[PDB]
Write a protein that binds this ligand. Structure first.
Ligand SMILES: [Zn+2]
Ligand SMILES: [Zn+2]
Ligand SMILES: [Zn+2]
Lengths: 159, 154, 159, 159
């Protein structure tokens, strides 16, 4: 009972959908905790700094932001990993930043992507509490990347 | 137990080829939980079957659960199938009314009266089982869900 | 433009008082705006996530709540800073969270405090408009910590 | 711009504190001019001849000495109000005098109080220049009164 989930690859239509919002019934359910645990375990196995439910064939509005320094991003901040339910980006900075991005859904193809340096973001926790919070720099970039998956968008469509 | 949201005709999730449940997923609490939620979702909605894509999960899991409902269908023990594969359809055909939780509009469908299906239990054991009649129509209905086919298209 | 004020320390008896309410005539006064400006610059210059008037020798019910990742609090969530005049917590949740805390007034001693996970607060803006806001998590800890300062309580008294 | 600060009253603990010295950062700051201006407006609203920051819930070493003839003090000299930052009394005359005193912080209790008739005093101006001046008589009495306030002493304790 510890699971790493298959990841969908660019080409497969599931990555182009608009994921459905998580419902009230799902909040604070073993179902949702287990979904989240699996996504989490999937992200770690691979070395990812975020992941989105659509990438593991779950067409639902859940993401994880989980920046940490590794060989790929030695400047990456430490943060406690944050599972966002039904996240909305409330505001983008007009101030831009150029970032190095890869995705598990776009294998052997990375690149440079322009992102807002700051985002203000509303989400629900896994227990179901309304939360609003602002991200800066690389975690902001991670939030824009995984929200993009939720609206059917891969990072290569922003280059 | 959780009652999950259900996708309606029009929604593109329902038109996909669902991905196979992989080996590491077999006998995982991820999977038991996925199935548990599909089951509660089905019972609460008076469905006689359900498929993972109906609840936003593009994985090859179906439940087949014929019983008299508000319909008058024969009662079976519900059976959960992982990566079901129909190895034989009969040429003999039955025609019946079909509804669908994703098509809230009824219609008449030509279905094989007999199917023989191979599947994995939640644990991961291969089972081959033959169905006749209305349970056989449920099997064919839900496998259509896994291949992006809604019952109106027949 | 702005000013970094001296800050009182554990043992100094100003920290032990009940701060006086800001009166009606002080509302929307340049006095008050200037007090708030000085308090805010003081907090930022010292990597504070909150501040209370009594810390800067002003025995008045004014606090700033400004959660932010910084060297004193590396994993703290970021909010827009909010200045509260006569804050009043009308509702503490029964749900308690436990976190590490520090005050600019209690140097080299951090510690573990039990705080309500949710608080609902009614306060007056600097202009004098009444507002009600619910806070969760670490921002709800800063709110409870700063109001504690306004009633003569340091966080060390709450282990 | 016009503000009258509330005044603390005998029995409230702000008035028992030793006020903290005003810091180098505060000198020649709009913070400090505004503080001084609100103390000045508060003294005048009541016809007072001096005032001390602690009376307006500000535990800081600022006083105003502002003698002017009155129904209460006819024959009290004319002087430009003088704002004193971090004042210290360097010398008291042994030459005692007995004056009538009252205090906004001590309502319906006035009385007769023994003061040194001459005081030599150093202070900083609001721009932060070191000054050293001598007061005789009633202005000398006002300085001793407001300095007492800085060291947590009300005139009735001198009886
Ligand atoms: Zn991605
Ligand atoms: Zn159906
Ligand atoms: Zn006095």
């Amino acid at each position: 009972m510890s699971v790493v989930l298959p990841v969908a690859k660019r080409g497969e239509d599931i990555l182009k959908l608009i994921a459905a919002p998580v419902s009230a019934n799902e909040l604070n359910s073993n179902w949702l905790y287990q979904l989240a645990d699996a996504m989490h375990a999937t992200m770690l196995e691979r070395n990812g700094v975020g992941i989105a439910a659509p990438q593991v064939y779950i067409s639902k509005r859940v993401i994880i932001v989980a920046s940490r320094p590794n060989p790929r991003y030695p400047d990456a901040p430490e943060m406690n990993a944050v599972v966002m339910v039904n996240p909305e980006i409330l505001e983008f900075s007009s101030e831009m930043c150029l970032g190095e991005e890869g995705c598990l859904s776009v294998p052997d193809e990375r690149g440079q992507v322009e992102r807002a340096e700051m985002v203000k973001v509303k989400y629900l926790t896994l227990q179901g509490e309304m939360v609003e919070t602002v991200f800066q720099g690389f975690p902001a970039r991670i939030v824009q990347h995984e929200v993009d998956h939720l609206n059917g968008i891969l990072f290569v469509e922003r280059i």
